[PDB]
Amino acid sequence: PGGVPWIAIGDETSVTSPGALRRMTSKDIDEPLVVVTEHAIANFTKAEMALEFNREFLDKLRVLSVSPKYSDLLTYVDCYVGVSARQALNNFQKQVPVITPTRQTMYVDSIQAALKALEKWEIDLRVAQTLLPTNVPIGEVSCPMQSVVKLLDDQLPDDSLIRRYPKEAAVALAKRNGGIQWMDVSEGTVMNEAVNAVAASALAPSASAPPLEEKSKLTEQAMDLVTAAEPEIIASLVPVPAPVFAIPPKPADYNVRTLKIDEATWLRMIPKTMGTLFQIQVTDNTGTNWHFNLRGGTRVVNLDQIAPMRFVLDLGGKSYKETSWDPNGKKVGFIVFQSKIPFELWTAASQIGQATVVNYVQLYAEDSSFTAQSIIATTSLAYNYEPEQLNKTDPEMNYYLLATFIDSAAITPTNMTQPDVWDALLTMSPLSAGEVTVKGAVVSEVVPAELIGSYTPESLNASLPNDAARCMIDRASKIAEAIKIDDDAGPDEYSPNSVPIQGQLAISQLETGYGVRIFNPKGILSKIASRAMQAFIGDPSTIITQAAPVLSDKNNWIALAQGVKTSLRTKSLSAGVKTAVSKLSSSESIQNWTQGFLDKVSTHFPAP
Amino acid sequence: PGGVPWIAIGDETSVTSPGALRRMTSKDIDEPLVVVTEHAIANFTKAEMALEFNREFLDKLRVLSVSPKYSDLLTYVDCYVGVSARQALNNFQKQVPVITPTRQTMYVDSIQAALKALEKWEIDLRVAQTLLPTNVPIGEVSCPMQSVVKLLDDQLPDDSLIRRYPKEAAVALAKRNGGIQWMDVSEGTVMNEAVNAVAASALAPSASAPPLEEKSKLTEQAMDLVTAAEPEIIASLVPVPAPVFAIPPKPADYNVRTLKIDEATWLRMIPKTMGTLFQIQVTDNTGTNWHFNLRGGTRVVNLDQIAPMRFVLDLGGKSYKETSWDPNGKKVGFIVFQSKIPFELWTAASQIGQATVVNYVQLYAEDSSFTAQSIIATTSLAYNYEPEQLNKTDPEMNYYLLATFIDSAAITPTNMTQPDVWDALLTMSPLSAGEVTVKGAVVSEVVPAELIGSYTPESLNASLPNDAARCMIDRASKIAEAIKIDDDAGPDEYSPNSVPIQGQLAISQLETGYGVRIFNPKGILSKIASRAMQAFIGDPSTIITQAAPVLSDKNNWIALAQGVKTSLRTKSLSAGVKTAVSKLSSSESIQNWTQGFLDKVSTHFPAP
């Protein structure tokens, strides 16, 4: 039963309009009055049963021997009943169980106090169960009870009260587990007295089959995984908003000096062989001006369009030692320029436009265990790039990122010849969570089907940490895991989730398309479909990888994704025979090992 | 129902005292009477229903065609049944459901055998389901039965038992497929009257809305995340028990030559300029004597105070070539010295004290990739060291670990100038996670608020994996996941998640500003809060950053954490319609694509 008590606002037994009704009050019988659910009553009853499970310790504690009996508190009455006034006006009810919250609280507090008091006995009882094996993998085994007692007495806790109170522990163990047997000395009677025994036999797995509940649970978990993956999103053929498609990104490290300009569209560089060299000066946050020289081959990250990004650089163990340059004790910084002039075209400092020195550190160099090898001390040079902090308005304004040793005074060009210090190990942390990259560009939305099989290994490797392909691969790996949970078919073994792929391949060959037509036998297509599904599960990143042999078709991909979900939808308590038989064989062998151990115990713990 | 019928030995449940109560017996009517939960009765009924899905195949097996009616086996009789004797005395009931354990076992075994018998026929039927697209975006859709039959014949597998039993298969398809309806031979009527459609609706979206069970499961996963987080503990600013916060440590690799002792409190190395080289010889437990000399500038692991640790060393690629000594084929060893004098304070041979080589490796080297350069082969010198073996009883006693070449024969120091072979790839596995440093100080117990915002990026890098900050970050990642489930709003958009954040900033705005004091608009406050929240979504681990301007307030994080847990607890079935509707639209277009493909197939295999 559910709802709250409603009493006539004004005239008793003549109520017609909602205006005529009001919430019935405690003063009408002013504490709360609530309808008691049968389900709650049954659960409290189960709670009392757990208390009876722990009854021996509480009695030995000489405290609260009387059981709570929650059913006593219930009060059933005929009246208008509803969660809202409307229901009660249309819902008069009879004998509704009712109680005040405060009384329920007192009852629960008493139960909680009881559990806290019984805390030690249950732990000691579990210790008694774990002292020796208390359960058998299959069937049952038995041994000399006096020999069993000898072993228990030998390993029993020294301070255990059970050493003074064995019988209560014996009753408790007999209550939870059917196998342990304590004969009644008075009648010499022995029989299972447990009331959980029937339930245990009901919930035991069959002689050759695992429990039905396990199959249902696994299938439900697989469906939850598929729902979390979002098959419609992964297999989407229409544009998907970047926030909807994207998932949390992960950091990536790069060496800018070693990057290939034919791979990265996010970097700009001054042409080499130009012989260009010019020193430039930039103020720091304290207003100190710092001067450094720019030369051909100097490269910069093109900040515009890359989103807010945090960069941390570690040069530890590097050399960078020059004929007139020693990195030891040097100072380095990250340089960011803001100007309308392209960096590659820069020949003078003014084309750098707005620049500020905001960060620098003093370097340390040392010599390695290998002779003639010098090691730079570990560094953590960090630059935070906020495009919003720049607040770019003028499109002409171009943003460039540089990392180089920084000095307040223009450097003698002969002393330091490097175009930049980008030959360093860089750790990048995105400062943007709203930008994703597709086809070399940040995207507000993407086509997942187009995403399928659209990246070469080189392109994916060059991709930034915010790349859509990486997010797609993570979603694909979740789907592959879900498909593998749903299908236990081996490679080259057909399944309800692979045959649709075989059908798609057959339809594709039949379809009038382009190129040399061929007919493939159904069995071969079926084997290929099984292999394709296994390959997808093994390497979900293949889905955005170019040249997928069979998974390349977005329609094939959709069919497979939909098929696994449907298999879960129409599946009822499915199971695998091979695993169950292996478990039974293992259980029997373990039982044999246990029986041998018990025989050894009987020899080493002979009954007195 | 449940519990154990209770009476005195002469009459069960008739004992004034608890011990004599006895089980109801067949003489009362040697299996004990077994009470059954109403839920248990319903589940057994569902199991019998499960048999009916392919019960036609059982009829093919001619086994248990009759519906089971285990409820008939259930027998209701008035009696006193008590889980505890006290309980049975307290309450008396009538028409108690009863069963014999053996009968229950036989019934369950029979049901399991039936499922096992129907497994192959059911698998063929599931393959038949997988043969065609079987999911529809709204309700159910159907296809030409004749065209469907043509396709079944086109792709039908010969081995299918359906070839053995087609009519039953047709009945089963009608039983479980809304789209598949067979015209009645007698009535020429095609329709679905099966309860599978009722079953589909049970897990299907509601008449007025999409299914909310998935949203409920997602909310439950979020509550599980909150339970794992224990945020008040993870937001503590006051002393916390170390074990509850502590979590398992992770092994990490470092190069001692690359190691920077000054930045890290933990790192210990003999200072350079001591320049002390002395040859020492000791024998091991086996009794092998080894001659080796400690040299100036040598650094050693400070074993004292670091607890148990296992270390693996790779020296491959270090030239290490002596004038008359070839590094290839040489043996190097790890030496542990135990003595009162500080290793840095060591100036004489006697100072090393209990110095022992725990492990040593002899290895061969070959030419490297570098032109004219040879490379030592890949190596893993490894030793596991724990505190008990040292058994330190004296604080003066200090323990140190060193990597250097070790040989039984005396080795001339002039030829080999290396202070140590510590300039090598090293893998260290922690055997203890009890050491943390905060406030620039090593701490026995850790305060999460002290952990919050206490490490600079270089300082965090200095912090070892055992540092509490990493554990705080993992707890934050679970919290971050909960926050993400809670809010899917776009960046810079005010949201329920940021309400605690805006309130915290507002209190900060209320706070009198020490030195510079300014007032910021609540809408501007909302924009900044949105940026801050998006930044957290980008990187939760940033919270540990010392004095993090973005993550400056620990109390704000603590308050938000309580608020986020509340929002998850407060959440009552709230979900977003737009993504689902877009997915349904794509699904409908896919359904249209599927219809077109089936149409082309009918062109190939037209329905008569």
Curated annotation (Swiss-Prot), chains A, B:
GO cellular component, one term: viral outer capsid
MF terms (GO), sorted A to Z: host cell surface binding
Function summary: Major outer capsid protein involved in host cell membrane penetration. In the endocytic compartment, outer-capsid protein sigma-3 is removed by cathepsin proteases, which exposes the viral membrane-penetration protein mu-1. Both myristoylated peptides mu-1N and phi are released during infectious subvirion particles (ISVP) formation in the endosome. They associate with host membranes and mu-1N induces permeabilization and delivery of transcriptionally active viral particles into the host cell cytoplasm. Seems to induce apoptosis in the host cell.
Protein name in the entry: Outer capsid protein mu-1
Gene expressing this chain: M2
Domain statement: The C-terminal region, phi, determines both targeting to intracellular membranes and induction of apoptosis.
Coiled-coil segments: none
Subunit architecture: Heterohexamer of three sigma-3 and three Mu-1 proteins.
Source organism (scientific name): Reovirus type 1 (strain Lang) (T1L)
Family: Belongs to the orthoreovirus mu-1 protein family.
Keywords: Apoptosis, Capsid protein, Glycoprotein, Host cell membrane, Host endoplasmic reticulum, Host membrane, Host mitochondrion, Lipoprotein, Membrane, Myristate, Outer capsid protein, Viral penetration into host cytoplasm, Viral penetration via permeabilization of host membrane, Virion, Virus entry into host cell
Glycosylated residues (UniProt): 43, 391, 415, 461, 592
Origin organism lineage: Viruses, Riboviria, Orthornavirae, Duplornaviricota, Resentoviricetes
Free-text description of this protein's post-translational modifications in UniProt: Cleaved during the endosomal proteolytic disassembly of the outer capsid. Mu-1 is proteolytically cleaved into mu-1N and mu-1C during the maturation step to generate the ISVP. Cleavage of mu-1 to mu-1C is dependent on myristoylation and binding to sigma-3 protein. Mu-1C is further cleaved into delta (59 kDa), and phi (13 kDa) segments during entry into the host cell cytoplasm. Mu-1 and mu-1N are N-terminally myristoylated. This acylation is essential for the membrane fusion activity.
Top-level taxon: Viruses
InterPro entries referenced in this protein's UniProt entry, alphabetically: Mu1/VP4, Mu1/VP4_sf, Mu1_membr_pen_domI, Mu1_membr_pen_domII, Mu1_membr_pen_domIII, Mu1_membr_pen_domIV
GO BP of this protein: symbiont entry into host cell via permeabilization of host membrane
